[PDB]
Amino acid sequence: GMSYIHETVWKGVPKFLRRVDTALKNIGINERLPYNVSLIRFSSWMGGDRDGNPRVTPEVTRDVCLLARMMAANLYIDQIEELMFELSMWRCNDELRVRAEELHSSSGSKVTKYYIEFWKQIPPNEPYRVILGHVRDKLYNTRERARHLLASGVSEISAESSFTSIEEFLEPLELCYKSLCDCGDKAIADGSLLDLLRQVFTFGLSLVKLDIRQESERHTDVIDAITTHLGIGSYREWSEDKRQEWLLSELRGKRPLLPPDLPQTEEIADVIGAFHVLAELPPDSFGPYIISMATAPSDVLAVELLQRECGVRQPLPVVPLFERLADLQSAPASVERLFSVDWYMDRIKGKQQVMVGYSDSGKDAGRLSAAWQLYRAQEEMAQVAKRYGVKLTLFHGRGGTVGRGGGPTHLAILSQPPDTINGSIRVTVQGEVIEFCFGEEHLCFQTLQRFTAATLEHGMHPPVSPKPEWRKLMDEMAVVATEEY
Amino acid sequence: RQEWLLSELRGKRPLLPPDLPQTEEIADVIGAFHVLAELPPDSFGPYIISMATAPSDVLAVELLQRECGVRQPLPVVPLFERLADLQSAPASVERLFSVDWYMDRIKGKQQVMVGYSDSGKDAGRLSAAWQLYRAQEEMAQVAKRYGVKLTLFHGRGGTVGRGGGPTHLAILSQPPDTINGSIRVTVQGEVIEFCFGEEHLCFQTLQRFTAATLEHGMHPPVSPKPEWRKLMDEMAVVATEEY
Numbered sequence A: 001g002m003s004y005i006h007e008t009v010w011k012g013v014p015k016f017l018r019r020v021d022t023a024l025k026n027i028g029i030n031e032r033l034p035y036n037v038s039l040i041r042f043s044s045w046m047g048g049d050r051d052g053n054p055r056v057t058p059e060v061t062r063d064v065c066l067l068a069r070m071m072a073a074n075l076y077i078d079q080i081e082e083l084m085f086e087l088s089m090w091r092c093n094d095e096l097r098v099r100a101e102e103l104h105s106s107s108g109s110k111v112t113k114y115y116i117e118f119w120k121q122i123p124p125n126e127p128y129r130v131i132l133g134h135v136r137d138k139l140y141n142t143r144e145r146a147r148h149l150l151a152s153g154v155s156e157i158s159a160e161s162s163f164t165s166i167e168e169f170l171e172p173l174e175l176c177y178k179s180l181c182d183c184g185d186k187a188i189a190d191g192s193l194l195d196l197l198r199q200v201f202t203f204g205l206s207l208v209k210l211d212i213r214q215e216s217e218r219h220t221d222v223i224d225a226i227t228t229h230l231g232i233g234s235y236r237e238w239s240e241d242k243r244q245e246w247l248l249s250e251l252r253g254k255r256p257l258l259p260p261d262l263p264q265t266e267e268i269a270d271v272i273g274a275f276h277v278l279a280e281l282p283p284d285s286f287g288p289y290i291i292s293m294a295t296a297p298s299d300v301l302a303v304e305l306l307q308r309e310c311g312v313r314q315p316l317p318v319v320p321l322f323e324r325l326a327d328l329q330s331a332p333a334s335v336e337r338l339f340s341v342d343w344y345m346d347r348i349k350g351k352q353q354v355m356v357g358y359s360d361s362g363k364d365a366g367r368l369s370a371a372w373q374l375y376r377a378q379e380e381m382a383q384v385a386k387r388y389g390v391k392l393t394l395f396h397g398r399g400g401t402v403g404r405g406g407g408p409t410h411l412a413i414l415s416q417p418p419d420t421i422n423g424s425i426r427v428t429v430q431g432e433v434i435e436f437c438f439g440e441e442h443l444c445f446q447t448l449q450r451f452t453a454a455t456l457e458h459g460m461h462p463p464v465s466p467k468p469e470w471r472k473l474m475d476e477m478a479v480v481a482t483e484e485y
Numbered sequence B: 001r002q003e004w005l006l007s008e009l010r011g012k013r014p015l016l017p018p019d020l021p022q023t024e025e026i027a028d029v030i031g032a033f034h035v036l037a038e039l040p041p042d043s044f045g046p047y048i049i050s051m052a053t054a055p056s057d058v059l060a061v062e063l064l065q066r067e068c069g070v071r072q073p074l075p076v077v078p079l080f081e082r083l084a085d086l087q088s089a090p091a092s093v094e095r096l097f098s099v100d101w102y103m104d105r106i107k108g109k110q111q112v113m114v115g116y117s118d119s120g121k122d123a124g125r126l127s128a129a130w131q132l133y134r135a136q137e138e139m140a141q142v143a144k145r146y147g148v149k150l151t152l153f154h155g156r157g158g159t160v161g162r163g164g165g166p167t168h169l170a171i172l173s174q175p176p177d178t179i180n181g182s183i184r185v186t187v188q189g190e191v192i193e194f195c196f197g198e199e200h201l202c203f204q205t206l207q208r209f210t211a212a213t214l215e216h217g218m219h220p221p222v223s224p225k226p227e228w229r230k231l232m233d234e235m236a237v238v239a240t241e242e243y
Helices: A002-025 A058-086 A094-106 A127-151 A166-182 A192-206 A216-230 A240-252 A266-280 A297-309 A325-329 A331-339 A342-348 A359-364 A367-387 A409-415 A432-438 A441-460 A468-484 B002-010 B024-038 B055-066 B083-087 B089-097 B100-106 B116-122 B125-145 B167-172 B190-196 B199-218 B226-242
Strands: A209-215 A286-292 A318-322 A351-357 A391-397 A425-427 B047-049 B076-080 B109-115 B149-155 B183-185
Touching: A002 A058, A002 A192, A002 A432, A002 A441, A058 A127, A058 A192, A058 A209, A058 A266, A094 A127, A094 A166, A127 A166, A166 A192, A192 A209, A209 A216, A209 A266, A216 A266, A216 A286, A216 A297, A240 A297, A240 A342, A266 A297, A286 A297, A297 A318, A297 A331, A297 A342, A318 A331, A318 A391, A325 A331, A325 A359, A325 A367, A331 A342, A331 A351, A331 A367, A351 A359, A351 A367, A359 A367, A367 A391, A367 A468, A409 A441, A432 A441, B002 B055, B002 B100, B024 B055, B047 B055, B055 B076, B055 B089, B055 B100, B076 B089, B076 B149, B083 B089, B083 B116, B083 B125, B089 B100, B089 B109, B089 B125, B109 B116, B109 B125, B116 B125, B116 B149, B125 B149, B125 B226, B167 B199, B190 B199
Parallel strands: A209 A286, A286 A318, A318 A351, A351 A391, A391 A425, B047 B076, B076 B109, B109 B149, B149 B183
Antiparallel strands: none
């Protein structure tokens, strides 16, 4: 998966954002799209989704997280020393001038004989090369520190010697950008520098943010082992309303719950060990924690508690994956229950993400009934979210085949109900589809354009909602189609 | 306190919250227990409670030990240093010995320290000397009833006022059938030089403790007559009031 991120996606994102800017010019907008606008992001399940895969261990997740951070450092280094050669102008800010003189002074005039270019100290009349030279050395530490953590588990190089945050990385680059602009050299700043700035906001220090996926029953397994070992009872046999009140009392409570004395299977161990690895790695390497075959709000609350009682100091957002027909029918109710408890509303802060599965729902019912309940699920969930003032982001688990929800990207976005995207959507690119959409450069440009254009048109020029007669007929054949299936 | 501590030691749910606010003193107590969990268990003897008064003092440390990650907990020894604490010392030992959880933990072995310094400072020399005789005597009786092997820890200094005196004489003044080949004694400060400053002396010190502990076992001293006890009990009250 990361091979495509190297060979077409890395340079393809700034190329496409370039075309978005010329499009903006030819409709009267005399301004570039801000480089902090992430029109297209890239996430990954590889090494993160472990549902049905016991071979995706807590060590495997740790590997792909650090390895991606190393790959990110490699690509940034190439862009930086390329930008080092390019930015040879002498006019600069007052702020850049002071910066370039600060680092020129604080840096002793040592040479690095194995540096191919800029092996001696850089003169202060090349200010952009002075700042980018410090960025370059800080990136070399970032690459090697990731290499050491990956091989052993510790590095000689400090975190203070490397880039530990996007903000630490962006500060020198945005200083150069504002400097070039203040000298009337905006046209230069919009070259390789703009492409790199856009690459930082798109890819960050991890290139891709990892998603974690585990099935709900594996979480209930661990929680049942806790209550059984503590003598509270059996979490598995409690009703869902009871489950909700118990976990909400434990999330509101300050006393720990998970005992280190806990007897664990290999599976109950894999669940806790995965949460442990999440607590060790930096938060900016992860996306949401996804719950396979989510059924009810306790599955969400179970993960929320397990995260905190495993020491995850900044918890991942919990995303339910409604994969089967019965789960999608009750999904607007499950979301309303979560939006109505004060603890969970304070946690999510007006933003909720829900995944809908196209593969397992088409297998539960027919293709007709799955696609129609998936329409209704998204439709009613967005209505629940709007009532509670929550911005709902849909995650569509589409495959390559039509049976698993596949099809032309702009056609699929047109099939989704009106007023359910609104500039926030996640879509899976599964396996062979990664080759289909990013195997060559013109394919990557095509894919980014379809998603961008379809999503944009869907927001301001939505499809028509079905007529009441159309709904009733659709509901009636869904019953007949599932029964036939 | 004994009810809550036992419900918590019996319960297997953790107690120590991570976001717990701590003073500098509270941070040192927990940090010490963390250090005890990091280093091998064979580097440590027991965890002694200064100013121990009641079983909740022993049970609290037993809990703070496990609630701080000491996977192999040290034996918790109370130090009865004042007169009142020594008067209620066999009572404190008894209720500990009557708790099923504590008896499962100590496994028939118990250590108790008695402080010759602060007890002489609290009462008189004569009173403290007598009460320490009784505390040792009644505690050994409590331990034998409950089938426990008691090991007394004598914290005596160099000077007579802090429990000092010739080794074979200090062992002889201890109640009969309270040593039985298991005793700990503090060698305090300058006494280390007095006893081990040269090979000659170390051989004497080792020989004194070994001989006097062996003789006290097989050939114990006499127990006090009932009139002697009654006289000591009344003289002790007059001594401490005068002191």
